[PDB]
Point group: C6
Chain length 313, copies 6
Amino acid sequence: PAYRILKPWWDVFTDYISIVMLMIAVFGGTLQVTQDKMICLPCKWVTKDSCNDSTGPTGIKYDLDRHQYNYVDAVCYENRLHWFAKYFPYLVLLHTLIFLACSNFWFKFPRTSSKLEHFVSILLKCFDSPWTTRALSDKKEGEQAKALFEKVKKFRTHVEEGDIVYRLYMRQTIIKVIKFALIICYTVYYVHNIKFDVDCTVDIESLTGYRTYRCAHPLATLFKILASFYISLVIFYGLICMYTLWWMLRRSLKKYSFESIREESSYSDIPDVKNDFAFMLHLIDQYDPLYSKRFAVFLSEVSENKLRQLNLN
Amino acid sequence: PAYRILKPWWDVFTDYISIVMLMIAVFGGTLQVTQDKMICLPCKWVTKDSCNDSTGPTGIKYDLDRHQYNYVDAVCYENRLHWFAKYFPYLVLLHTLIFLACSNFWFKFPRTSSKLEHFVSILLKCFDSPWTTRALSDKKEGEQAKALFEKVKKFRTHVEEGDIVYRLYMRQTIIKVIKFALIICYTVYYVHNIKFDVDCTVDIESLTGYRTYRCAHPLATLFKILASFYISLVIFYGLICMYTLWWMLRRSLKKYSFESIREESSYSDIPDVKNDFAFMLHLIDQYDPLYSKRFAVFLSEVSENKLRQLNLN
Amino acid sequence: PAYRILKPWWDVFTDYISIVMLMIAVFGGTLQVTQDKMICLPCKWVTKDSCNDSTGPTGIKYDLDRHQYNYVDAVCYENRLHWFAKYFPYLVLLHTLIFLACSNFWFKFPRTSSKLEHFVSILLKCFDSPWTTRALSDKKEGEQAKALFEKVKKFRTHVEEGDIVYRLYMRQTIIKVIKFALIICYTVYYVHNIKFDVDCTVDIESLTGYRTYRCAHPLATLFKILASFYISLVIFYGLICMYTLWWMLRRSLKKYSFESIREESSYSDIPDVKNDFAFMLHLIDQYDPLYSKRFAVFLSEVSENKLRQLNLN
Amino acid sequence: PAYRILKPWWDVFTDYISIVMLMIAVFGGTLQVTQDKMICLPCKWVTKDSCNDSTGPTGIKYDLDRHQYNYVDAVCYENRLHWFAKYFPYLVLLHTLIFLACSNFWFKFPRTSSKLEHFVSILLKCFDSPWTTRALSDKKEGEQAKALFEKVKKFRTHVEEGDIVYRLYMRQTIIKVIKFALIICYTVYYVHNIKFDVDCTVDIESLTGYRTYRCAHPLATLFKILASFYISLVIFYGLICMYTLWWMLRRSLKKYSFESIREESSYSDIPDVKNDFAFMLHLIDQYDPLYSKRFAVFLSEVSENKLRQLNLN
Amino acid sequence: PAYRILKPWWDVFTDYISIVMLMIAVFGGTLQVTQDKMICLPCKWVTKDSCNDSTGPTGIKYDLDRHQYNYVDAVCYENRLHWFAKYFPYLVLLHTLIFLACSNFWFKFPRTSSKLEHFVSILLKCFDSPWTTRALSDKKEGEQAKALFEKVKKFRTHVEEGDIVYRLYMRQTIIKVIKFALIICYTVYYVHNIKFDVDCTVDIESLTGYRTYRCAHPLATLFKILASFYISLVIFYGLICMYTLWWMLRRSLKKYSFESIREESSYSDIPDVKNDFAFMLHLIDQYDPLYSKRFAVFLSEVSENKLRQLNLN
Amino acid sequence: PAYRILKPWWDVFTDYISIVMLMIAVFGGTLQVTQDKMICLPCKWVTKDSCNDSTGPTGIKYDLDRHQYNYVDAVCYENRLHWFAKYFPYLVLLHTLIFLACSNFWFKFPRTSSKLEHFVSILLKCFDSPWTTRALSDKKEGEQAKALFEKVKKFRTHVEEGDIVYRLYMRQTIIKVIKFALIICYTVYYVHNIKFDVDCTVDIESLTGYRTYRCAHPLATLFKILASFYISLVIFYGLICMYTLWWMLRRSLKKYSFESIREESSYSDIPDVKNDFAFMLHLIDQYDPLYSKRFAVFLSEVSENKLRQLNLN
Ligand SMILES: CCCC[C@@]1(C2CCCC2)Cc2cc(OCCCCCCC(=O)O)c(Cl)c(Cl)c2C1=O
């Protein structure tokens, strides 16, 4: 629904890179389903499995009908063609689905989804209160504010015991970084293996007569373009993931230094949050600090004290 | 709607695995209806009903036009090819539909659908009531709270007599486990029977002249890849099903023990729910214990006393 | 809308069986319009207008180019092939459409659709009314309660004189049963006429030279698979329809015995319903008896009294 | 908008017949675009521009390569095939579009759309008022009641001068019947020009060498099936239209006799609507008579007097 | 939204005609992408750039394989085929997109979209206020009415100074008329230059061996049908546009004649709107005069004085 | 949502040009993947690696089968065909995606998205309140009037510090202008390369026997048409971007003088906005100046004082 408030800028660029990855994966997949044939001809003069390259010119007659051209095309396409040419779109579709599942497992797991839903509910109610204006700058509104005070205190006593959300959000980015590393380790190593002019030697003499054939796989340049684009796009994804991993392993997100807002607002009775709530408060501060600024007045003892004083008067 | 509360975490992994099942099923189906052909050539020298493997090289002339090549391709495609190589996408699509119907029959059945809707409505209303904050730690909401109290008192007697929800959720998982057992029983046995080389001896000499042929089914490798992926993914599905069946036969879900709320909430008078409401309370406890914690205040005669002296005074 | 209460489980299983029959119909139709060809070859030796079946092997030369292969393919495909092999997907799509029309004509015909929507509206309002709590356990709410009383009395005086809903729901299921009988009557008789090998004798000697041909129909096995699947699915559909017809002609749904509820609710002055209102009373009791549970108090004259002296006092 | 209440039952069957017409039109269209081929062979021996039909058998060699077979297929497909075979899907699609435009121009025209919207709004407000039950069987309800009375007296004077809706819905049905007459006049006359066997005598000897050819249009049987289905289905359409035309020129919908409501409601003072409002009230009665019955209270002068008495006391 | 108020009847027929123009455009486009080929044969005997046209008959042998028929087909398709046969669907797609852009630039331009949105909002608020029923024929209603009065006066002071909507609607309709003139000027001139048979002479003897050719373009009849249909449809479009241009240049739409409603409402104090607002009131009068009747009381000085008297008393 | 008010007219024309660009890009892409063919023929009598062009006419025989023709087509399609003839649709799709990203990045970045949405929300709320018209021409209305005064003061204190929105929306246009310069710089330089006639000398005699081939790219004319259309569309896009860049560097949008509204309304105690607030207020003044004028009252301290006087009274 309105879960955009728990997404930083590095989780949106990820969400669009993982969309264009799906785009190129589907495009390569449908193109490989559509054509992906390889045209093969036999060499007459051959030495050490290499073609010898030895009035008016006339055509060379091989004396083959079409159907055993199709057979040798299928055989040399299956056997002597490197597998990375054949199944590259089906690899990258799997990789981008694993990336999407790893990105959205944090939302879809219920043990943290409930906590996130309750958190966004109480922050929406805290943001849509009128009495924070008086707290920062009638009896029914005061008791309504007291009800918000009690439910915010209940949330604070509830969620500050666990570590599951922070642990899950650590374990998502660490395996994203590992997957990026593995992708870069094999894909650029095998990307040279696709090319156009390819030989084959498939040992079928009893069916055609020739021993060695020279083939021409014609989608190779386009597949090379798509693979290079995929390499650059995965590089960008990995730089984003490495940056956010460094940020989260350096900035010590477990506790929130809340004193800076309270010093200027002169509300000294608001302490630091212990764990698993200060992390989400950091993450919404990464959206904007105004939401965390409006949350001080719903956890300050002087603020409940003026609330009950106004209710008594 | 708001039925996502009733679905545990293992019912979401299942619901996404059963989606990618249908994805690979429709992919195999569209590939098979698009091409699924096979190219056959005859062997001139026959030994043991096989191919004997017996100045420049020249082609071998069979003296066959294209159309009887098409005929022998069709005959060797039907008579000498295993049925698992042809109808595997339709088979896995059928099994995917069986799993989906098994998972949603417990919802669309009306006798349990009515009880589930009633249960989720009273949990939403009890979760939205503000009297829980006063009970754990104006008057007109007191009498509507009394109305909710009477509604819960009616519902508790109304659903105590049943067992249908627990029976259906037992039966659905046990037949899902049986379906897993059969699927892994036959698929891994028959998966070896698809291969790129197939020899056919279809006994048509009056139409072509040759007796034995030698073919090349070009999609065998891709179908083997899809089948192995399907087997591993079914293995994940069945591991989840065996885990949830073990949990059901282990934790004794028929009755509920309620003292873990009452001991720390200081409400000495609370009952223990008997059956078919205890199971649903377990099902929402798997989501979170907070909903069961806020449901305790609507079940105590001392809370009835608090409301009665509250709205009298 | 919210007419889904009026559908029992036997009218939801039917609704998915219709969907899956439409799915197999459109799949067979798109496959048949895609290829559905038939490869044909002539036989060089003829006995009883059929193929006689009479150093190394060599091919047989027929001396026919491609175009007069295609001509004889078309001629043998039209003149000497059973019509059930060609128009089976169109036939089953037509049957699925007429089953859907027989399902939804009851809901789209206005002279009963108006009665159904009025009925479901007043049952929703009567079930959601707050006076049922005190009925089963102020003053202006009493005025809306007696407005509900008067509109229920108006509905009872109006719709009881009809018979059209019961008449239509007779005449829909009975013709569904007749159509099942017809489908099972012809389909299992004509299903054995599809096969892979077919011999056409078409008497075209001035265009090719040969007289009798032999043909292969590669789609025969898959069409037989789909046909057997459709036969089994129709048998299950007709079992559902015969069960609901047996129940409906057994229990004699014209009048309701309302005496069961007043035995425990101690409201002896609640009468029986004559006709064409007890029908949907049964039809909503099949959903759940709670809606008829919370409807007795809105038609009884002692409840009229209880509201009347409540407003008086 | 809310125009579903304005459509009688004879415009419900029409709206689905017009959908199945469009679906068979688009099926024929995709057929005729996708393949719609013709296969042609020459006759060596001719007798008055007709084929004379004159050890082992051998083929007949025509000495024609494939591309001048394609040429003679093109020329014999255009010059010697009837136009009803080629453009029948486009004809039926055009007629379906004209039927839809004819049946919805009555709604899309603004000069009557405004009147229909105002009419359905005031009947919704007449149906929503609780004062009707009080009139048939405390002061603010009288205020909105008298507002509704005054706006009904405004509407009745506003819409009584026109004659536009009745005239347009004359013209709609009468041109629908006329188009029925034309369709059945020409389609069953031209349906016999589609046939599997077609003979062309084009006399292009300078490019092939032969004079006459004997062709085979392969989709003729399926096109004949579709055409016969279309004829029967548009016959059903025309019988529906003729029935509603006869109904509308029999029942004399210009004026509304309205005695049947006042005789059972005891309201001796009510008038008869003159024109152009009587027809629409007949139409909503044809939906159901309840809305026409409930409209008597907002026009009777004694009802106005009772409302004025309740507003004064 | 509900912006159908601001579109007259001549701007809805225009919209539907634009939709069917785009439909035939995309149909012709996908047809021309899918096949659009042409079959060409050489003429063995030539006289003045034309074919000389000179036991049993035998075929003519050209000794040309299929691929150099494909070459001559491509060459004679590019050079000696008229371009209007080639790019007519793309031309008509461009024309219908230009027509849609011209029809919606008036709405999407914000400098007029603001005025249209404010005008339609004010007219709807004037329609929905219940004080109009009192005005044409207790203090909160008067305050709401006087707030509406002052905002109507401020809106009148606002929009009377500009003149941009009328001028943009001028510049819209006049370019629509000029574009129609251009389309009809060139399309009927070039429509005669598509035909089935066409003679090409491309001077390639070093590759094929012949000089001139005879060709056949199989889509010519369908393209001519679509072109004639488009010309008739564009004629209808231009008749509609010239009619509305004549009406709008004849009625002098800048200033309103508001006397004919004040003389029957007996509100003698009402001013005539000068420009750019009276044109909008003319446009709403083209929908219905009821909105003009209800808008009279929200500008009358005696209506303001009656409201002041009601507020004071 | 409500961001359409806050987008000038030069971001709607751009937003439609950048969907026409995507439409022609996807059309070119699907055409190129569908056909991707070019027909090549060998030249016998050659000079300087070019085709020298050195009873009745007869065809020229090359003694080549079809599969060698396919091979030489593939080779001359890869090597001697320019890359701009092949990857132009993918290039223009990439440029379209870059333009769309530069269009929507200023929305999707959260650090400015928060400011933009908060600004548009408070503008909508200030436009919604009726007290503005009273100020520019019941104490509870003053209470939320003072609440909106306070939160507008908080907004003015908050957003006026930074410059990020102005910096981003300047950077986006300057890089769009740079991208325009690059595209126009290279596309018109490379557009001359595509043509129907292309020669190739690929040095493969061991496989065919010939050395030079003359070819024909049958889609070069349509690709040239699409390229010229794209160049014109790019030119119009760049003119729009040059206009908005000149507008930015000419109006000096950093501060906003507020003199006109205070001069016409005699509210002399109004301030001048410093930065990052004047920019967005300019950008909605481009929509209409009335939204800026209705915000004048809420910044006015004499309006604050007169509200204080009304609250005192
Ligand atoms: C007039 C003399 C005929 C002799 C010929 C030789 C070929 C080897 C032995 C003789 C030439 C030829 C061309 C054909 O079309 C071109 C090759 C296949 C493309 C079909 C398109 C598709 O892929 O659908 C076909 Cl089909 C045949 Cl059968 C034959 C022959 O028979």
